[PDB]
């Protein structure tokens, strides 16, 4: 598939301050490079505040707390198509993909 870094919703090395400027409505999301740590982050606006979920990488899979996917785009598209919460604890759901400012 199309590599992660070419996805319209992959923003690379943007800091948290920029995430808060780019996400506007609940369920707006982007994926970015880690800032204080090296793993990818799925950042999602929920009730006015960004929530930051580290995407775990292991055994050739990517996951949050559920299924393992062979790529991050597949994880994202699954979350969007099922509308399942990213975690049971959070209740956060993806609704729409925020494009990279560039």
């Amino acid at each position: 598939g199309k590599p992660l870094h070419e996805q319209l919703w992959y923003h690379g090395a943007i800091p948290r301050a920029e995430v808060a400027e780019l996400l506007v409505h609940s369920g707006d999301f982007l994926v970015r490079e880690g800032q204080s740590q090296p793993d990818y982050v799925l950042s999602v606006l929920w009730d006015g505040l960004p929530r930051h979920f580290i995407i775990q990488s292991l055994d050739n899979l990517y996951r949050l707390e559920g299924e393992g996917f062979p790529s991050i785009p597949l994880l994202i598209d699954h979350l969007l198509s099922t509308q399942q919460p990213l975690t049971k604890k959070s209740g956060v759901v993806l609704h729409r993909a925020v494009p990279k400012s560039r």
């Binding site: 800032q35 930051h52 979920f53 707390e65 990213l86 975690t87």
Partner: peptide, 6 residues
């Protein structure tokens, strides 16, 4: 920085 418990 705070991250979601996952």
């Amino acid at each position: 920085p705070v991250y979601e418990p996952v």
